[PDB]
């Protein structure tokens, strides 16, 4: 089965990952240096042993594609993946007139009462971003995110580089180029960033008219993050291949530090007892080919019949 590589990764970490403590000491078992590969000709690698909200990866990807870095687009599609990073700034500012909200993501978990005040301040925030263009342009704009790194890489000459756009062009004119790389790691920004890019860089490759992609991920949460990550870049490979008129190749996922948070031990073990089902099939709108102008309705997934969703504590 297609998802086997991910299940194998889980096993290896379980019985070979060594205990390493991270910033918050949730605790992790980890390995360093790993590579899985998925053949997109067999099916889309969306985990079947656990339901994964594809809508969330579809809108988040489009968000990056448009070179957007403003939360508003996400909220318009009910995608609250990036909220806390934006909300963080709204709290740590001059106009914020409310409860402390300091260490919210942590205090909430350790307090069923704070989880409510925080839940509301967040709700109000999301609303203001959704209707106050000025508030949106100020607290909704994340600035340095994948959308701007991929498509608005700032140069020392005050200009902007559309890395993705250019590479898709180089794919069409120079298919056998060994320099078809998009990077999200900028040394001058990384040391100030709240969250330096996890998905450091990716390289495209063409052969026999098939397009493959390799992704180097410097850090990965195996239980929570990876299932989203696999689908995201498997989707990109399909889209970029749609625009370039190529047939799908392989998705190679390379890992630096792949870890399993000690608090997700039983959820993963449970998932492992599950037997994979046949993979779903993706279907991209044939009439539209400018992937930059793609919409939610343009990407269609089929025959995805997963197991129940597993609930786990987002380590922090």
Binding site for a copy of itself (CB under 8 A): 1, 4, 51, 66-68, 70, 72-73, 76, 133-134, 136-137, 140-141, 151-152, 160, 162, 165, 266-267, 269-270, 273-278, 288, 290, 292-293, 295, 305-311
Does residue 81 contact residue 232 with C-beta atoms inside 8 Å? Answer: no
- Measured from the CB atom, the residue of 95 and 305 that comes closer to a copy of itself is 305
CA nearest 236: which of 215, 257, 216?
Answer: 215
CA–CA gap between residue 251 and residue 13 (Å, rounded): 21
What's the min distance (Å) between Cβ of 56 and ligand UMP?
A: 11
Instruction: Tell me the helix, strand and coil percentages in the chain, rounded to 5.
Output: 40, 20, 40
Please identify which of the residues 117, 181, 198, 316 carries the catalytic annotation.
198
CA–CA gap between residue 249 and residue 229 (Å, rounded): 18
Answer with the entry of a copy of itself, K ion, ligand UMP, none that 183 interacts with (C-beta below 5 to 8 A by kind): K ion
Answer with the entry of ligand UMP, a copy of itself, K ion, none that 177 interacts with (C-beta below 5 to 8 A by kind): none
CA nearest 152: which of 143, 142, 165, 162?
Answer: 162
Residues 207-236 that bind ligand UMP (CB under 6 A): 219-221, 225-226, 228-229
- Measured from the CB atom, the residue of 134 and 195 that comes closer to ligand UMP is 195
The residue sitting closest to ligand UMP, measured at its beta carbon, is 225
- Measured from the CB atom, the residue of 147 and 249 that comes closer to K ion is 147
Task: For the chain, give the residues followed by a break (C–N over 2.5 Å).
Answer: none
Measure Cα distances from 288 to 166, 209, 291 in Å.
20, 20, 8
- Contacts with K ion, 148-187, as mask; x by CB under 5 A: -----------------------------------x-x--
- Measured from the CB atom, the residue of 121 and 214 that comes closer to ligand UMP is 214
- Measured from the CB atom, the residue of 171 and 226 that comes closer to ligand UMP is 226
198 noted as active-site residue: yes
Does residue 253 contact residue 47 with C-beta atoms inside 8 Å? Answer: no
Q: What is the DSSP string of 138-207?
A: IIIB--SSHHHHHH-EE-TTS-EE-HHHHHHHHHHH-TT-TT-EEE---TTTTTT-SS--SS-EEEEEEE
Q: Under the criterion CB under 6 A, does residue 186 sit at the interface with ligand UMP?
A: no
The residues that are catalytic are 198
Interface residues toward ligand UMP, by CB under 6 A: 195, 198, 219-221, 225-226, 228-229
Give contact residues for K ion (rule: CB under 5 A): 183, 185
């Amino acid at each position: 089965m297609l998802e086997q590589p991910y299940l194998d990764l889980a096993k290896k970490v379980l019985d070979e990952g060594h205990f390493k403590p991270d910033i918050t000491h949730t605790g992790t078992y980890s390995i360093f240096g790993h590579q899985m590969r998925f053949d997109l000709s067999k099916g889309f690698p969306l985990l079947t042993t656990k339901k994964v909200p594809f809508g969330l990866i579809k809108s988040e990807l489009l968000w990056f594609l448009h070179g957007d870095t403003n939360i508003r687009f996400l909220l318009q599609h009910r995608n609250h993946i990036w909220d806390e990073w934006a909300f963080e700034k709204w709290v740590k500012s001059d106009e914020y007139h409310g409860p402390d909200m300091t260490d919210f993501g942590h205090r909430s978990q350790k307090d069923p009462e704070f989880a409510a005040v925080y839940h509301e301040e967040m709700a109000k925030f999301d609303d203001r971003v959704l209707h106050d263009d000025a508030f949106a342009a100020k607290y909704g704009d994340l600035g340095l995110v994948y959308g701007s790194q991929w498509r608005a890489w700032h140069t020392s000459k005050g200009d902007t580089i559309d890395q993705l756009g250019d590479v898709i062009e180089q794919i069409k004119t120079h298919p056998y180029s060994r320099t078809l790389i998009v990077s999200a790691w900028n040394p001058e920004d990384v040391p100030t960033m709240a969250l330096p890019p996890c998905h450091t860089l990716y390289q495209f490759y063409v052969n026999d008219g098939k397009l493959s992609l390799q992704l180097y991920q410097r850090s990965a949460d195996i239980f929570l993050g990876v299932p989203f990550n696999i689908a995201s870049y498997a989707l990109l490979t399909h889209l970029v291949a749609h625009e370039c008129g190529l047939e799908v190749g392989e998705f190679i996922h390379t890992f630096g530090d792949a870890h399993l948070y000690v608090n997700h031990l039983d959820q993963i073990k449970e998932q492992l007892s599950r037997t994979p089902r046949p993979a779903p099939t993706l279907q991209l709108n044939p009439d539209k080919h400018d992937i930059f102008d793609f919409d939610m309705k343009d990407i269609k997934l089929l025959n995805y019949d997963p197991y129940p969703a597993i609930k786990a504590p987002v380590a922090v």
